[PDB]
Amino acid sequence: HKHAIPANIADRCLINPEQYETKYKQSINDPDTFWGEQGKILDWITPYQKVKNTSFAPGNVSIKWYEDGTLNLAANCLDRHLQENGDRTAIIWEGDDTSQSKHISYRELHRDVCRFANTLLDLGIKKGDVVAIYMPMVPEAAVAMLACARIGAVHSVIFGGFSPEAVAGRIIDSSSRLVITADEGVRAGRSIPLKKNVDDALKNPNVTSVEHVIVLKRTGSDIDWQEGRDLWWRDLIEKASPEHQPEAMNAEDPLFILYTSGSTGKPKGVLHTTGGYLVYAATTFKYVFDYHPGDIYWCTADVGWVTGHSYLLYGPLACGATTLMFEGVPNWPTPARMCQVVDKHQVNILYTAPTAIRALMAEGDKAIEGTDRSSLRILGSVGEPINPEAWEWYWKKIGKEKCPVVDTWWQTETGGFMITPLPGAIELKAGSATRPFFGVQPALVDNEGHPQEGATEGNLVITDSWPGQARTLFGDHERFEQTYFSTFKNMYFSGDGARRDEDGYYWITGRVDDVLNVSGHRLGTAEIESALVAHPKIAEAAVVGIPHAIKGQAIYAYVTLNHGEEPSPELYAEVRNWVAKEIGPLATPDVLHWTDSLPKTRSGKIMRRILRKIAAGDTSNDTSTLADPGVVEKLLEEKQA
């Protein structure tokens, strides 16, 4: 059953049950009045008059919010906080090594953002240029992102764990003019070779657009240097003026691109504009985490993911919050690390991932030994379904049974929270994301697109726009419409399945398309398959996900070798290492299943449902449409070994 709203939260909450009901209704009945007023969470240089201007219609997918208005993201996240709060900490940085930490005030962060903005301008970067950021979890990554946004450059942040090949791919598609990186990242007492990875990427003959690499000397390690191209971060920023006046950007000027894995093909650049995105990030942050001035807030997500964009940086700083950036991992040196960070910086709001929760839960009270945790008032969960038992352990052990847990469902494409509890408004069910946010109209449809009413399950769609919605796929608006708006006409299709219960609470069950969730990472089965087939011994591959107690899903790859090739344990590790090279360690198959028995239909289609079942440990329960039905038996045998 339900968790009641505690008394401490009821007494302070920004949105109560009744305000949620009232605001939700208006957001839906009158978007223009609702978002017109809510848009004032931001400072606008010239005020908007238009609010909502959107369509999901076939051939006319067009999303626009606050369009005739102008603003600066960096002014909203920095400059406007200066007069009264310049001395308030903007970012608490906690090093992988706990002996290393910083408190960076709004004034401090502003100064460096201005210097770096000038640094970028002097290097020839202009409004609209794409800048590639390949950084570890250090404050300079934020400086780099905020400075791009200040001058209307379009940053494209590349998760540090991506391979040189994956970096090349993102740089090529985006025509990035500059790469910003560090010599090495530090994670769990170990180096990560970032700049070296950038060198390798830039040797790709198809990379033609990068003019400079800016390098942060994080570790001081010996690295290669290309004279002319490579520039030290300190060398540049020390030469730069701390004076920079922000220019008005139009609400619909592109702000960033984020490569995101899909059901088809290689990752695409999901694009966000400026006004609606930032309004939505600030609004969701404030109401869902119940942010009050003085609250120390910690989102654990990496900067290279949308959660790190919206909920580490943009949402929090637009609201004048203290946000915490942690360089390392929540269980190094010990499982208690996460709660040690909480104690050390008196974190009041913690927002993390079920993969982490499961990792700490496996260690039991080792995750909490010698720690206090009393500063916490709110907990959050993101990025993957959370099982009830994990949710209960998190609520009990980290939250001391005193903290609401906000399970926030959303996606790169949605820009901010979509279905989520509000801590003082909505009673909680372990495992449920609960109710839509203001502006969000979800529905469940069957495979044919008939809407399902009452307590039911189906494909999760959103039937109208909301300020934070992604506007396009970089350089390919037609693929944007086809990818999201063609399956169920006039609706945004998320690619998730969900059930809705008798209370109207949504329970998100995961992707219904060919998209995996591995340790919280969204990866397409097809991109793993291509990476596998690029191997000169591999003929065919079929990749499925299997349940995994820790990772949520593990990657299971059926692999057909070229005629004349035999498997080995040598080849096992080789092929795993090959995928880690093609994409990154995050996409390394957990299982390689050597076979010549892929179930192909008369047409040649791969019978993917059978492969899924077999990989999952099913041994029983159509084979008639199938060239050689005997493959199923062979597949089972091989699985049993």
Ligand SMILES: CCCOP(=O)(O)OC[C@H]1O[C@@H](n2cnc3c(N)ncnc32)[C@H](O)[C@@H]1O
């Ligand atoms: C939210 C930041 C991560 O965004 P990405 O675009 O990388 O992945 C979005 C997908 O993560 C899952 N997902 C995300 N949050 C939840 C969630 N809270 N519950 C269940 N599944 C979730 C859903 O399948 C979704 O389609």
